[PDB]
Automatic annotation (TrEMBL):
This is Fucose-binding lectin protein. It comes from Ralstonia solanacearum. Zn(2+) 5 binds at residues 59, 144, 230. SUPFAM superfamilies: Fucose-specific lectin (SSF89372). Zn(2+) 3 binds at residues 45, 130, 216. Zn(2+) 1 binds at residues 45, 130, 216. Zn(2+) 4 binds at residues 45, 130, 216. Keywords: Lectin, Metal-binding, Zinc. Mg(2+) binds at residues 6, 92, 177. Pfam families: Fungal_lectin. Gene3D superfamilies: 2.40.128.190. The modification N6,N6-dimethyllysine is found at residues 24, 33, 69, 82, 109, 118, 154, 167, 195, 204, 240, 252. The keyword Zinc applies. The keyword DNA repair does not apply.
Length: 256
């Protein structure tokens, strides 16, 4: 089946969903007025994405992978351009300049490349895995990162909280992760052999979430309005991606 990556921003919000299909990555966009096909169009068998706002202007980084080569595509308001980033599965997160962290699963090994505003360098993360997802949150200036590494049917959470990578309490399969607030609350979606289920953290242990829908692949994005969380899960079977919406139960979204 296809596989997707999703990012969102702003008050509307705007959403961008990238789809790797038959060697080509395309983009579908929401700006509150219906879904439309965006301008991003590049080769790749795997895609991950991150984005940040500068004022009212979105900046987007899309990581497109073919074989072992990952190309970074940059939206900074004037067309898509090839970024400096130097088969594989990737997952990406960013915070703040910005700083960016890209995790790559390659032949059972997950490694990490980092952007700090100066150049790309190889981060400390090395753990086994065939599938990878990631989420992060700031507590002040302090980044906290959670990487979900999957091998077979086991998914291992790895935690960055300022002083090394520690194995998390979380309990190949393909995952997608999002988080919100300062506790934080986390939600991890896992596509396992045709079905997507949910595991949740609210600061006091992991438990089964209410989301349960079919799909071979999953991506996710979320935003806060005040303290209310809104979540969009993109579940794909074949070339069909269904959007599932949490806005306070889960309802089928308008995405096509
Ligand atoms: C870009 C337009 N302007 C004019 C208003 C601008 C805006 C912000 C900065 C600006 C300039 O400069 C600096 C400089 C520093 N320094 C001094 C050298 C370090 C202490 C610090 C903060 C700001 C910052 C800055 C300060 C606070 C918060 C964010 C930034 C920033 O956007 O940051 C943008 C900085 O970009 C300059 C360096 N740069 C940017 C890139 C772009 O790279 C692309 O984008 C990257 C994010 C990656 O994806 C990369 O692979 C890809 O190729 N390559 N080199
Ligand atoms: C009774 C249990 N203990 C001690 C035995 C405890 C309790 C509370 C804290 C404790 C410890 O430590 C801290 C530390 C900090 N700092 C200092 C600046 C940050 C480095 C701040 C507050 C407290 C807090 C804290 C104080 C007030 C309000 C909230 C917290 C808190 O939950 O905060 C979280 C601390 O642990 C308590 C509950 N908790 C946190 C985790 C973190 O777990 C990881 O991170 C999670 C988000 C998930 O990824 C999870 O799977 C992964 O294992 N597991 N249980
Ligand atoms: C003025 C009174 N009317 C029309 C007579 C009205 C207004 C709002 C809703 C209304 C009705 O009905 C629903 C019904 C549901 N349910 C039941 C749980 C399932 C369908 C949920 C929410 C509302 C909403 C609703 C609640 C909160 C936020 C937005 C909306 C909305 O859809 O419209 C507000 C206008 O905002 C711009 C137009 N808009 C927003 C959306 C939300 O779309 C979803 O969310 C987007 C972010 C995307 O992910 C998209 O694919 C997905 O379908 N659709 N159209």
């Amino acid at each position: 089946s296809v596989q997707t990556a999703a990012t969102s921003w702003g008050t509307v919000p705007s959403i961008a969903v990238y789809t790797a299909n038959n060697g080509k990555i395309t983009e579908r966009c929401w700006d509150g007025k219906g879904w439309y096909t965006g301008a991003f169009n590049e080769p790749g068998d795997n895609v991950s994405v991150t984005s940040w706002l500068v004022g009212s202007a979105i900046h987007i980084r899309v990581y497109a992978s073919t074989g072992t080569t990952t190309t970074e595509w940059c939206w900074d308001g004037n067309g898509w351009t090839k970024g400096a980033y130097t088969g594989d599965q990737t997952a990406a997160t960013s915070w703040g300049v910005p700083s960016i962290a890209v995790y790559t699963a390659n032949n059972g090994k997950i490694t990490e490349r980092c952007w700090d505003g100066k150049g790309w360098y190889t981060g400390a993360f090395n753990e086994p895995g065939d599938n990878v997802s990631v989420t992060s949150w700031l507590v002040g200036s302090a980044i906290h990162i959670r990487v979900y590494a999957s091998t077979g049917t086991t998914t291992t959470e790895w935690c960055w909280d300022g002083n090394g990578w520690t194995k998390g309490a979380y309990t190949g399969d393909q995952t997608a992760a999002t988080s919100w607030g300062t506790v934080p609350s986390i939600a991890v979606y896992t596509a396992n052999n045709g079905k997507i289920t949910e595991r949740c953290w609210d600061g006091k242990g992991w438990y089964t979430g209410a989301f349960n829908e079919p799909g071979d692949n999953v991506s996710v994005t979320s935003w806060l309005v005040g303290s209310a969380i809104h979540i969009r899960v993109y579940a794909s079977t074949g070339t069909t991606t269904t959007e599932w919406c949490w806005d306070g139960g889960w309802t089928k979204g308008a995405y096509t």
